[PDB]
Design a protein around this ligand. Structure first.
Ligand SMILES: Oc1ccc(CCNc2nc(SCCCc3ccc(Cl)cc3)nc(N3CCNCC3)n2)cc1
Length: 231
């Protein structure tokens, strides 16, 4: 119970996930995917601690929290990937150890399309000159919006709306602080939210390559983390 103007941006700042490290040698196909799996899993753990820290997230329903974390993990992952690779054209800084060149993608099939997508999206964010604050704000919006929107017992859908609300407000706020004119303050918001669907787009393709292995996805797998230990 809070959600203020900057007390949120600063909060979203101090809630950020830790940098994550993976073992490694070198590399080929599974070499790239043995790591990426051990990468996104370590991260998915911190992603939960993260959501947990967004003021009011735990006040929601448990099934809703899991509902939400299940839909965004992929784009939230890629949102942080892009942000880490924003000042590096052609590269995709997956982690302090996992840095991949564009070309290095083709060496494994299907993957190369995504790099083009990420790099393309990353370049757009770069060109817009996305700020650390706007980035913090867009990341949580992705988590608060990615859901299956009732079949009633609504007090969650209320609090959730109030939460997506505060974030969205902080974001128009950040843009306003920028000082530009209302025609531009609006265009900024519009340009940044239109990219979220490109992050969605890239999120769908990726998840499609993922499942294209032999499985069919972290549900309970990280269900008992919201459960008790809260770690
Ligand atoms: O901050 C981060 C950290 C990590 C990432 C990437 C996380 N990527 C990731 N990729 C695969 S990939 C087969 C992939 C083909 C492919 C190739 C390229 C891409 Cl981008 C996606 C998929 N599989 C998984 N997981 C994690 C959860 N348990 C089940 C498997 N994660 C992004 C941002």
């Amino acid at each position: 119970d809070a959600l203020s103007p900057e007390q949120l941006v600063l909060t979203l700042l101090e809630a950020e996930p830790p940098h994550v490290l993976i073992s490694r040698p070198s590399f080929t196909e599974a070499s790239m995917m043995m790591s990426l799996t051990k990468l996104a899993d370590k991260e998915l753990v911190h992603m939960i601690s993260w959501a947990k820290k967004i003021p009011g997230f735990v006040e929601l329903s448990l099934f809703d929290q899991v509902r939400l974390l299940e839909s965004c993990w992929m784009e939230v992952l890629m949102m942080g990937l892009m942000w880490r690779s924003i000042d590096h054209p052609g590269k995709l800084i997956f982690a302090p150890d996992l840095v991949l060149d564009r070309d290095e993608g083709k060496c494994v099939e299907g993957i190369l399309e995504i790099f083009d997508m990420l790099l393309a999206t990353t370049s757009r964010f770069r060109e817009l000159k996305l700020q650390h604050k706007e980035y913090l704000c867009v990341k949580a919006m992705i988590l608060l919006n990615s859901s299956m929107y009732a079949t009633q017992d609504a007090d969650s859908s209320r609090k959730l709306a109030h939460l997506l609300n505060a974030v969205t407000d902080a974001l128009v706020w950040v843009i306003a602080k920028s000082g530009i004119s209302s025609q531009q303050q609006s265009m900024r918001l519009a340009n940044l939210l239109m990219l979220l669907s490109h992050v969605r787009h890239a999120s769908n393709k990726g998840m499609e390559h993922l499942l294209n292995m032999k499985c069919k996805p972290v549900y309970d797998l990280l269900l008992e983390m919201l459960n008790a230990h809260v770690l």
